[PDB]
Design a protein around this ligand. Structure first.
Ligand SMILES: [Cl-]
Ligand SMILES: [Cl-]
Ligand SMILES: [K+]
Length: 162
């Protein structure tokens, strides 16, 4: 298990534009296109992202290219965020992947708002952090995925993805 395999499980792979869990146009392995309700706007974002007129459909290799870019951007995003960087640096490699997963799903700003959970993670108060993480819109709206991520933070193992 690694961050790519983890997010591939959580996000799936679809080669046509689809709506994500929040109703937003997305493609590939959870590549958000736009929050606009306009399908034409989403198709424009897609073509810009890929560099050709895709008419709402991409190939697996293109999906995986966007995924590489998105994972890189989530990680470097963590390192550029003054709230997230110290927590990330304090963590082991498996728990780092849990934090990357949250940022991929909700964005840096959103994750940086988990102030109390982040502090418990930095303190290595794993059971307490896990309880706190679940007190969230995130958990209530996507509970099965959040439970997997939270188990990863609680244990520092891949048990929820094996
Ligand atoms: Cl709750
Ligand atoms: Cl879920
Ligand atoms: K998805």
């Amino acid at each position: 298990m690694n961050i790519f395999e983890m997010l591939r499980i959580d996000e799936g792979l679809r080669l046509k534009i689809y709506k994500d869990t929040e109703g937003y146009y997305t493609i590939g392995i959870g590549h958000l296109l736009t929050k606009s309700p306009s399908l034409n706007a989403a198709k424009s974002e897609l073509d810009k992202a890929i560099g050709r007129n895709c008419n709402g459909v991409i190939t697996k290799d293109e999906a995986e290219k966007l995924f590489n870019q998105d994972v890189d951007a989530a990680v470097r995003g963590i390192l550029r965020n003054a709230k997230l960087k110290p927590v990330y640096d304090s963590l082991d490699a498996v728990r780092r992947c849990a934090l990357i997963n949250m940022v991929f799903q909700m964005g840096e700003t959103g994750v940086a708002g988990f102030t109390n959970s982040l502090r418990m993670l930095q303190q290595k108060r794993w059971d307490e952090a896990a309880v706190n993480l679940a007190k969230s819109r995130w958990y209530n709206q996507t509970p099965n995925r959040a439970k997997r991520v939270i188990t990863t933070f609680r244990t520092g193992t891949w048990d929820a993805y094996k």
